Design a protein around this ligand. Structure first.
Ligand SMILES: C[C@@H]1O[C@H](NC(=O)c2ccc(-c3cccc(CN)c3)o2)[C@@H](O)[C@H](O)[C@@H]1O
Ligand SMILES: C[C@@H]1O[C@H](NC(=O)c2ccc3[nH]ccc3c2)[C@@H](O)[C@H](O)[C@@H]1O
Ligand SMILES: C[C@@H]1O[C@H](NC(=O)c2ccc3[nH]ccc3c2)[C@@H](O)[C@H](O)[C@@H]1O
Ligand SMILES: C[C@@H]1O[C@H](NC(=O)c2ccc3[nH]ccc3c2)[C@@H](O)[C@H](O)[C@@H]1O
Ligand SMILES: [Ca+2]
Ligand SMILES: [Ca+2]
Ligand SMILES: [Ca+2]
Ligand SMILES: [Ca+2]
Ligand SMILES: [Ca+2]
Ligand SMILES: [Ca+2]
Ligand SMILES: [Ca+2]
Ligand SMILES: [Ca+2]
Lengths: 114, 114, 114, 114
């Protein structure tokens, strides 16, 4: 199944935050309407926040997270969870290796903001 | 029901990261084994990361998030989600007012690290 | 925070299914647009499926679950999770006593159908 | 990433329930310790329950859901959600075709029971 693709309400502000947990340099690209809107890179085995940003879902509401290491796309796992019918998290894990910890880059999208 | 309380595997590193979305300064306490292990304070209406840290679950595995604003405990909402039977997210939202956006302080706990 | 309330897409079929795990007789009411649309009852300590039904979310998409035992409202916990940006589960747990297993009545709402 | 695999505590009673939403006849196998512990089949486009059972996680704690149609394994999606640090849901969706609704067989695993 496709992973790392989320439909937000249109014209909604959201946060996106990436964490790194690998010997490999993570490249995290965040697309909105199929266009890169944020990019983060870094290497950490201590959960560094390699980037955080605030974006708007725009007219399409389409948000995609891609994770690659040195040009190689990592395997993605994702889901969306909603608490009290209001608070939204879109979650991504990624595996760049063989150990299957799926934490090599971890991306969390949150909304609403404000 | 109790919210903001999570049982992690014992003696395991985990990340904890807080965001603010409120006109009021947020005070986030992270307890491990019923004792303060980290404290974050900050103010934003645009999802600023007011703190991030790496902690150890220690012998109890017991992690509790509390959020207070001007000394009043905020109402919490929480859950844990596990992806590919491996990647763990413990999620917290908080409400300090009347609008019920539950994003006033948003707390994400992630494990494993590394 | 409010629990057991979910906004579904409007005018969409969904499944609602209740399970019992208590010595108490569970009564589960499912409201659509603030009116009772389904009522399930039963007693089991072995996860009986006391009811399952297909409903339509109607014009508001508002679905609410309430649980009671002998007229006493149970305390509810809930969340929604979405898999591969398509497959939706709205989940309810309920507590009628003092052990805090929150499984006394368990309700699962699923969509899409078909 | 692997999907439909869950680690339960050892020797834990759990509910598993399956629904069908396809023209294809679903076969759902639930493995415990890599051995078939329950098999369900049915066909519905209206979310009919095609199986429900109570099983034991046994010494391994290893639970796997497999879905096939006409001898062909369906593509799975899965996640685990924990409410109030106590109530567990292990959720499975499956796709047997080309529409990507991932509801062809929907499987819910819940614990604790009792
Ligand atoms: C921007 C909005 O900020 C709201 N919070 C408050 O308004 C708040 C936090 C503390 C206080 C506060 C303290 C002391 C005296 C007073 C009364 N003047 C008030 O107000 C959020 O709930 C909302 O979702 C929005 O993000
Ligand atoms: C420290 C360990 O790092 C592993 N990743 C690596 O070892 C790794 C992955 C991709 C790479 N591309 C270039 C060098 C390189 C190295 C991770 O997959 C593993 O989970 C763990 O975090
Ligand atoms: C077997 C146990 O049953 C408990 N519930 C009860 O024993 C219970 C709760 C409410 C009641 N109202 C009238 C009779 C009655 C009995 C549950 O709360 C507990 O989790 C466990 O399932
Ligand atoms: C009614 C529709 O049925 C679809 N499935 C099928 O039409 C389907 C899938 C696999 C099959 N193998 C043999 C016959 C056969 C038929 C489903 O994939 C689709 O989502 C929808 O529920
Ligand atoms: Ca890895
Ligand atoms: Ca790693
Ligand atoms: Ca608020
Ligand atoms: Ca707010
Ligand atoms: Ca109980
Ligand atoms: Ca019970
Ligand atoms: Ca299908
Ligand atoms: Ca289908």
């Amino acid at each position: 199944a496709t992973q790392g693709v989320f439909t937000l309400p249109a014209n909604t502000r959201f946060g996106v935050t990436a964490f790194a947990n690998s010997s490999g340099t993570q490249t995290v690209n965040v697309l909105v309407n199929n266009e890169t809107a944020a990019t983060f890179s870094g290497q950490s085995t201590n959960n560094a926040v390699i980037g955080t940003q605030v974006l708007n879902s725009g007219s399409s509401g389409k948000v995609q997270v891609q994770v690659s290491v040195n040009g190689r796309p990592s395997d993605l796992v994702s889901a969306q969870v909603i608490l009290t019918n209001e608070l939204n998290f879109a979650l991504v894990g990624s595996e760049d290796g063989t150990d299957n910890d799926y934490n090599d880059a971890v991306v969390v999208i949150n909304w609403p903001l404000g």
